[PDB]
Every structure is written in C-alpha cells, then in structure tokens.
Design an enzyme around this catalytic site. Structure first.
Site, PDB file in Angstrom:
ATOM      1  CE  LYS B  44      35.995  38.586  37.323  1.00 53.78           C
ATOM      2  NZ  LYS B  44      36.750  39.874  37.071  1.00 53.78           N
ATOM      3  CG  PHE B  83      22.088  37.834  49.167  1.00 56.98           C
ATOM      4  CD1 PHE B  83      21.148  38.770  49.406  1.00 56.98           C
ATOM      5  CD2 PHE B  83      22.775  37.323  50.227  1.00 56.98           C
ATOM      6  CE1 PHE B  83      20.950  39.260  50.686  1.00 56.98           C
ATOM      7  CE2 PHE B  83      22.595  37.791  51.491  1.00 56.98           C
ATOM      8  CZ  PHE B  83      21.683  38.781  51.727  1.00 56.98           C
ATOM      9  CG  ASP B  88      26.602  45.166  47.914  1.00 60.83           C
ATOM     10  OD1 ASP B  88      25.833  45.349  48.894  1.00 60.83           O
ATOM     11  OD2 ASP B  88      27.597  44.459  48.031  1.00 60.83           O
ATOM     12  CG  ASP B  92      26.991  50.685  45.324  1.00 61.92           C
ATOM     13  OD1 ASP B  92      26.970  51.006  46.536  1.00 61.92           O
ATOM     14  OD2 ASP B  92      27.662  49.767  44.787  1.00 61.92           O
ATOM     15  NE  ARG B  97      27.706  43.814  40.298  1.00 63.96           N
ATOM     16  CZ  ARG B  97      28.564  44.000  41.287  1.00 63.96           C
ATOM     17  NH1 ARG B  97      29.722  43.387  41.300  1.00 63.96           N
ATOM     18  NH2 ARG B  97      28.241  44.762  42.303  1.00 63.96           N
ATOM     19  CG  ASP B 159      32.225  50.222  51.980  1.00 63.78           C
ATOM     20  OD1 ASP B 159      33.140  51.014  52.175  1.00 63.78           O
ATOM     21  OD2 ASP B 159      32.001  49.799  50.870  1.00 63.78           O
ATOM     22  CE  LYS B 182      31.126  45.707  49.860  1.00 61.86           C
ATOM     23  NZ  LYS B 182      30.612  47.009  49.352  1.00 61.86           N
ATOM     24  CG  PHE B 221      41.558  39.387  45.881  1.00 63.23           C
ATOM     25  CD1 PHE B 221      41.765  38.914  44.617  1.00 63.23           C
ATOM     26  CD2 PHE B 221      40.323  39.810  46.256  1.00 63.23           C
ATOM     27  CE1 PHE B 221      40.730  38.863  43.706  1.00 63.23           C
ATOM     28  CE2 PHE B 221      39.268  39.758  45.373  1.00 63.23           C
ATOM     29  CZ  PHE B 221      39.492  39.294  44.103  1.00 63.23           C
ATOM     30  CG  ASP B 225      39.413  44.761  42.948  1.00 66.56           C
ATOM     31  OD1 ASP B 225      38.754  45.823  42.881  1.00 66.56           O
ATOM     32  OD2 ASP B 225      39.122  43.701  42.380  1.00 66.56           O
ATOM     33  CG  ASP B 226      40.983  48.946  46.510  1.00 64.10           C
ATOM     34  OD1 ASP B 226      40.002  48.478  45.857  1.00 64.10           O
ATOM     35  OD2 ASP B 226      40.985  49.135  47.743  1.00 64.10           O
TER      36      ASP B 226
HETATM   37  C1  1WO Z   1      29.023  37.757  39.683  1.00 63.35           C
HETATM   38  C2  1WO Z   1      30.402  38.301  39.037  1.00 63.35           C
HETATM   39  C3  1WO Z   1      30.383  39.783  38.542  1.00 63.35           C
HETATM   40  C4  1WO Z   1      31.657  38.121  39.664  1.00 63.35           C
HETATM   41  C5  1WO Z   1      32.245  39.204  40.156  1.00 63.35           C
HETATM   42  C6  1WO Z   1      33.484  39.135  40.716  1.00 63.35           C
HETATM   43  C7  1WO Z   1      33.988  40.267  41.371  1.00 63.35           C
HETATM   44  C8  1WO Z   1      35.334  40.300  41.744  1.00 63.35           C
HETATM   45  O1  1WO Z   1      35.818  41.094  42.589  1.00 63.35           O
HETATM   46  C9  1WO Z   1      36.051  39.332  40.993  1.00 63.35           C
HETATM   47  C10 1WO Z   1      37.575  39.508  40.954  1.00 63.35           C
HETATM   48  C11 1WO Z   1      38.094  39.156  42.307  1.00 63.35           C
HETATM   49  C12 1WO Z   1      38.016  40.962  40.524  1.00 63.35           C
HETATM   50  C13 1WO Z   1      38.182  38.522  39.991  1.00 63.35           C
HETATM   51  C14 1WO Z   1      37.481  37.175  40.055  1.00 63.35           C
HETATM   52  C15 1WO Z   1      36.525  36.815  41.181  1.00 63.35           C
HETATM   53  C16 1WO Z   1      35.509  37.957  41.455  1.00 63.35           C
HETATM   54  C17 1WO Z   1      35.312  37.992  42.951  1.00 63.35           C
HETATM   55  C18 1WO Z   1      34.185  37.902  40.821  1.00 63.35           C
HETATM   56  C19 1WO Z   1      33.582  36.754  40.267  1.00 63.35           C
HETATM   57  O2  1WO Z   1      34.242  35.466  40.349  1.00 63.35           O
HETATM   58  C20 1WO Z   1      32.306  36.905  39.676  1.00 63.35           C
HETATM   59  O3  1WO Z   1      31.730  35.904  39.214  1.00 63.35           O
HETATM   60  C1  1WO Z   2      40.190  31.183  32.432  1.00 60.93           C
HETATM   61  C2  1WO Z   2      41.587  31.225  33.094  1.00 60.93           C
HETATM   62  C3  1WO Z   2      42.566  32.067  32.247  1.00 60.93           C
HETATM   63  C4  1WO Z   2      41.526  31.795  34.379  1.00 60.93           C
HETATM   64  C5  1WO Z   2      41.796  33.147  34.503  1.00 60.93           C
HETATM   65  C6  1WO Z   2      41.754  33.740  35.742  1.00 60.93           C
HETATM   66  C7  1WO Z   2      42.040  35.090  35.827  1.00 60.93           C
HETATM   67  C8  1WO Z   2      42.529  35.631  37.018  1.00 60.93           C
HETATM   68  O1  1WO Z   2      42.854  36.828  37.075  1.00 60.93           O
HETATM   69  C9  1WO Z   2      42.566  34.810  38.155  1.00 60.93           C
HETATM   70  C10 1WO Z   2      42.301  35.721  39.394  1.00 60.93           C
HETATM   71  C11 1WO Z   2      40.968  36.471  39.234  1.00 60.93           C
HETATM   72  C12 1WO Z   2      43.426  36.785  39.487  1.00 60.93           C
HETATM   73  C13 1WO Z   2      42.247  34.851  40.659  1.00 60.93           C
HETATM   74  C14 1WO Z   2      41.158  33.808  40.533  1.00 60.93           C
HETATM   75  C15 1WO Z   2      41.282  32.929  39.268  1.00 60.93           C
HETATM   76  C16 1WO Z   2      41.450  33.772  38.035  1.00 60.93           C
HETATM   77  C17 1WO Z   2      40.213  34.618  37.731  1.00 60.93           C
HETATM   78  C18 1WO Z   2      41.512  33.011  36.876  1.00 60.93           C
HETATM   79  C19 1WO Z   2      41.213  31.648  36.732  1.00 60.93           C
HETATM   80  O2  1WO Z   2      40.917  30.792  37.785  1.00 60.93           O
HETATM   81  C20 1WO Z   2      41.239  31.060  35.512  1.00 60.93           C
HETATM   82  O3  1WO Z   2      41.004  29.881  35.457  1.00 60.93           O
END
Ligand code: 1WO
Ligand code: 1WO
Ligand code: 1WO
Ligand code: 1WO
Lengths: 330, 330
Positions: B44, B83, B88, B92, B97, B159, B182, B221, B225-226
């Site tokens: 994302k 990386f 990870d 694991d 992924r 962890d 972490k 955050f 997530d949990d």
């Molecule tokens: C490389 C890719 C899978 C990727 C994983 C991400 C794992 C997360 O924990 C995401 C959440 C925090 C649940 C939501 C958005 C941001 C996180 C850290 C995330 C990505 O941006 C992401 O590119």
């Molecule tokens: C593409 C647009 C809807 C958009 C959605 C996003 C979803 C999210 O859940 C936000 C969180 C992961 C909770 C926090 C980081 C930003 C997130 C992923 C987010 C965007 O930035 C976003 O532009």
C-alpha cells in the site's frame, strides 16, 4: 605473529560496549551477546589484524585512543565477515564452520539465524559510531563498509546463479568475477582501504591503485584456496576438501574444463556427488591433466605479476604493506 | 489520495538506476531486478508516501530535483520494508504476502532469498548515495536508516524469543516493547524523521519530540492491527486472521491474560493450533471478556492521548503532519 593475541583480547571490550539502561530489551541483548561470541571468535583473524598492522605501517599520532580505533575497525571487518558466513552457511546447508556446528544448526536457532546475521551487520555501524563519530573519515568508513557489503552480496548472487547446489556456466571470466566480488574486495581491499582512511589517506587514485594490487592478490589467494582444497595436506590445513562434492565453481574445474570431450562427459557424471568413488574419479582426472603443475606455474607467474603490481602501484604507500600480505599468502 | 500513483510511477526510475558498464555481473543485476520487482511492489506504499507528503508539508525550495530526492527516500523506506518482510517470511515459514506466494517459496529461490533480502538492504544505501551524496543531511540519512534497521532487528529478536512458533512471556511490557522496536520506529518515526532531515530540520529535540508522538501512534496502530486481525470484517480488510494459529504475542492475548484461572488453562489448550474448532474456542472467549469493548475504550483513550501529544510536542512543526497520519489510522 603474537600481535593477533592483542587483537583477540580486545574482543571483550567490543562485546561489553555493544551490550547495554534500556532494560525492556535485555533478553534481546543477551541473545546478541551469544551471537557475537559464537560467531565472531573461532577463525584466524587475518582480516581484522590486517587493519591494525596496516594502520601502524601507514601512520607516524598514535595515542592510546588512535590505536583503540584501529582494533575496533578491525573488529568491524571481522563482524562483517561473521555476518556473511552465518548467512552463507544457511544458504549452503553447511554442517560446520571453524569446525563447530554452524550457528543455524544449533537446536533452537534454526532460521532465526537470518536475523542474528543481520544483527552482526548492524553492529558494524554501531561500533563505527561509538568510536568513529568525531573523526573526519567517519563517513568514508561507513561508505566503505556498505560498498564492501554490496559487492560481497552481488558476488554471492553470482555464485548462486553459477553453482546451484551444469558446467557450461563454469568459465574463467565467471570464476574471476565471482572471486573479485564475493571474496577479494572485502578480504583484501576493505581492511587496507580502511587503514588508509584512518591514516588520512583518502584520495581516489591512491585507493584505486591499492585496489588494483589487492584484488589481484585476492584472486590468487582464492585460486590457491581452491588448489589446496583438493591437493593440500589435510593436517597442514586443518581440513579435508569437499569442493567437488558441492558442485563448486572451483578454479580446478575451470581449468579442467579448458583442457578436456570424453573427459567432459567423465566430469558430468562425477562432479557433484558424495561418494569417494566419484571424487576419486575427478581428482585422478585433475592429476592426468597436470593441474598441480598448471597451478605451480600459475603461482610463479602470479607472484611475478603481484610484485610488478607493487612496484608500479604502491607509491606513495609503503610497499611493505602490500609485501607483508604477499609473503603471507605465497 | 491519488498522490500514491505518482509515487509508484517513480519506481520505474528507481529500478533503472539500480540496474547497470560492468557486464561481468549482469546475470546478478538481472536477479536484483527480479527481486526488486517482486518484493517492492504489491503493498500500500504508506510509509514511502509518508516521506513525500511530510516533505511537502515541511519545506517552502521545491525544484524538480528537490522533489525527486523525496520520492527516492520514500522508496528507500519501501526498500527497507521489503528487506524485512522477505526475511521475516522465511523466518516464519509464511506461504503468502500481499497475497502472492512469498519470494522464498518460489521454486528456485528458496533460501537464496536471504541474500536477496540483503541486496534490498544494500540498495537503500546505493540510492542515498546516488541522490543523497551532495546534500548536507546525507550522513544524517544514512545514520537514520542504519538505526532504524538495528531497532527493527532487535525487536524481531525480541519477538522470536517471546513467541517461538508459552504464555508467561506475553506481558504488556513485553508487548509494548516488541511493537516499539519491531514496528513503530521504522513505520512511523523513520519516514517523518527522514522528511525532517531533508527539510533542514536536524535538531535533537525536534526529532525527540516527533519521536515521542510517532511511537505512540505506532503503538496504537499495531494494537488496532491486532484487534482487526480477529474481529475485522475480512472484506473491508482484504484478509482473514491467523494471529491465534500462529502463537502470536497479539494485544488480544495480552489483555485476555490480564483478565483470566480455568480460562488461563482454556487458553493453554487452544492458543496456537490450526483447526477452527480451537480458534473458535479463544475468539469466543475473547468475546466473553469483552475485548472488543476494552478495545473501543482503548481507541478512544489512545486518540485523546495522541491529540494531547500533538498539542504538546509538535511545535514548531506543522501539527498537520501528525494529524494527517492520525486521521488515517483512527
Ligand atoms: C509491502 C506491503 C505488504 C505492505 C505491507 C504493509 C503492512 C502493514 O502492516 C500495512 C498496514 C499498516 C496494515 C496498512 C498500511 C501500511 C502497511 C504497513 C503496509 C504497507 O504500506 C505495505 O506496502
Ligand atoms: C487509497 C485511499 C483510500 C487510501 C486508503 C487507505 C487505507 C487505510 O486504511 C489507511 C491506513 C492504512 C489505515 C493508514 C495509512 C493510509 C491508509 C492505508 C490509506 C491511504 O493513505 C489512502 O490513501
Ligand atoms: C571466521 C573464520 C572461519 C575465518 C575464516 C577464514 C576463511 C578463510 O578463507 C581463511 C583463509 C583465507 C583460508 C586463511 C585465513 C583467513 C580466512 C579468510 C579466514 C579467517 O581469517 C577467519 O577468521
Ligand atoms: C600464527 C602464525 C603462524 C600465522 C600463521 C598464518 C598462516 C597462514 O597461512 C597465513 C595465511 C592464511 C596464508 C595468510 C594470512 C596470515 C596467515 C594465516 C598466518 C598468519 O598471519 C600468522 O600470523
């Protein structure tokens, strides 16, 4: 000679300093402790020592502090080496190293060693900062350790493409290129480069010149390692050789292939299996193409050439720094 | 919003620039290419974007170049993340992924992914040097990426000690400490810290202040997530949760344990096995201790507290930089 003892005795402090006033994470720091102690002690320390020896030879300004910074950066080289081996051993499925059991083969470590190896990498930069944060060659050192890592990794990539665990890929050009990147840069240029920068010597040309000498030395040294793997006296070495078993892009198979048709075939069936029926087969074939004599002759030519390299490329550095290493490898 | 598109379109250039006039090693550079493309695209992009967004918000001096350096350092954050994940996933034994197959599970990659992951790490510093070698915050950036790596690794160590693949170890203090090291440091402080330095803002106190805000945001955050892992709508998320199956030191088990005796026992038999007989057992037990309501109440308190943190610790940085992130996580 004995100087190696003074270098090992400095390991104590290294570990003290990397292991501490955030108690949330002590369990992790204990684990780091164990990783360092298992994985950075055991070898011959030549690369770390080289830093120290080369530093003395290169500077006039040698206060207690100035020195400590030398045995530290030396230990950094050792740490970079440990990072690579721990990771290489996993990637290879090795059993032993130094011959103790490989870290990852320890019950309860397994593939956690990947993170352990990354910690070893990180400790390099923690050390530099602790001791190398006020000096002016600080940045230069960080960049060198990073560049050396990258080169080593690229080389390991090359190796793993070349020799997945097929002989068209075993060329001279490929072999020289694996050795330069995987071994020679971090084994021969890093330590001296690093002494250079500590000693004020930061010019592009001086480093390039030194690089030219040290990579060739590196090339020979790995070629000699390959020769000695099979044809070394196992108790002058402290090993017996498994290059053949392991489908390794050794210098002996490169040269064997250059001199093979129905012996090509004979190499197909016997390179890279495990019983000393089939290791005997190739060894004896190496003997029949006089690889030992090709090697003798290479070692003679290679020495000639290193000396020419030193005469030409050393100044204004003391030739001794390069000659010290030469005497030791040849 | 759409800005994310402009960031992804800059990935092309990133890869061009990391993939080239020494042809001895092209086979290796091709492999690097494949590693970057599989492993840095898919997510994302929030952390990389955060760098860019925070940079715009923090500077006045925004030439075409100044910007390029932003989307590059953003990509560096993404690279550091790749990386970690590649490594990870191996550690694991994950299957997927992003849900594609994990890199290491690809036929012909296997444990070679350890070196691939190290290459991703190294590309960080190759980028910084390419774009970040003349600027004055160069050193500051290198140090930040190194420190972030170390923290993340220490946390992963923690962890892996806490949750080898026994519940006395699942404490609050341990949980907060895993999350901080972490996750929170590299996810929340790194990207903003990095924008800070790019924008001239290099003071210890400003960074400390920002750190205080961002680590708390990080903590929430990961707690969210949990919570969402088990009790999230699977199609608002794009996943279904396996925290329980995997003996994870989730925030839900921390809080469950704080509120358990004959339910302790009930957690013993059912935490960390694979059939949704036994996942049902714990979920339903979580419901019976009103973890959802404990969570609601935490999210309310935690938001209150972030806002107090911003009011207090933000100046002279634009509150918006912290509020933008808050709105998005809460
Ligand atoms: C490389 C890719 C899978 C990727 C994983 C991400 C794992 C997360 O924990 C995401 C959440 C925090 C649940 C939501 C958005 C941001 C996180 C850290 C995330 C990505 O941006 C992401 O590119
Ligand atoms: C593409 C647009 C809807 C958009 C959605 C996003 C979803 C999210 O859940 C936000 C969180 C992961 C909770 C926090 C980081 C930003 C997130 C992923 C987010 C965007 O930035 C976003 O532009
Ligand atoms: C950490 C330890 C096993 C260790 C391994 C070494 C591997 C080598 O290739 C050694 C030789 C070149 C064969 C001989 C001495 C130097 C080398 C690089 C070496 C160590 O110094 C060493 O500590
Ligand atoms: C302890 C002393 C005898 C000593 C032995 C060494 C053995 C060697 O083979 C040399 C090479 C590995 C060939 C080249 C590096 C230095 C070596 C390991 C070496 C010493 O430095 C050394 O002091």
């Amino acid at each position: 000679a004995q100087e190696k003892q003074d270098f090992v005795q400095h390991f104590s402090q290294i570990v003290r300093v990397l292991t501490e006033g955030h108690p949330e994470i002590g369990d992790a720091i204990a684990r780091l402790k164990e990783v360092l102690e298992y994985n950075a002690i055991g070898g011959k320390y030549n690369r770390g020592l080289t830093v120290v020896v080369a530093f003395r030879e290169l500077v006039e300004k040698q206060d207690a502090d100035s020195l400590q910074r030398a045995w530290t950066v030396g230990w950094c080289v050792e740490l970079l080496q440990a990072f690579f081996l721990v990771a290489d051993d996993i990637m290879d499925s090795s059993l032993t190293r130094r011959g103790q059991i490989c870290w990852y083969q320890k019950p309860g470590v397994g593939l956690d060693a990947i993170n352990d190896a990354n910690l070893l990498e990180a400790c390099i930069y923690r050390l530099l900062k602790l001791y190398c944060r006020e000096q002016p060659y600080y940045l230069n050192l960080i960049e060198l350790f990073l560049q050396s890592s990258y080169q080593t990794e690229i080389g390991q990539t090359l190796d793993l493409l070349t020799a997945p665990q097929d002989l068209v890929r075993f060329t001279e050009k490929r072999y020289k290129s694996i050795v330069k990147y995987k071994t020679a840069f971090y084994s021969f240029y890093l330590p001296i480069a690093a002494a250079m920068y500590m000693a004020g010597i930061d010019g592009e040309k001086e480093h390039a010149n030194a690089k030219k000498i040290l990579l060739e030395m590196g090339e020979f040294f790995q070629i000699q390692d390959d020769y000695l793997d099979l044809f070394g006296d196992p108790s002058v070495t402290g090993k017996i050789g498994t290059d053949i078993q392991d489908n390794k892009c050794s210098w002996l198979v490169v040269q064997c292939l250059q001199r093979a048709p129905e012996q090509y075939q004979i190499l197909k069936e016997n390179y890279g299996q495990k019983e000393a029926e089939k290791v005997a087969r190739v060894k004896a074939l190496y003997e029949e193409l006089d690889l030992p004599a090709v090697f003798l002759q290479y070692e003679e030519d290679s020495y000639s050439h290193i000396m020419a390299l030193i005469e030409q490329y050393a100044a204004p550095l003391p030739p001794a720094v390069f000659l010290g290493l030469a005497r030791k490898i040849y």
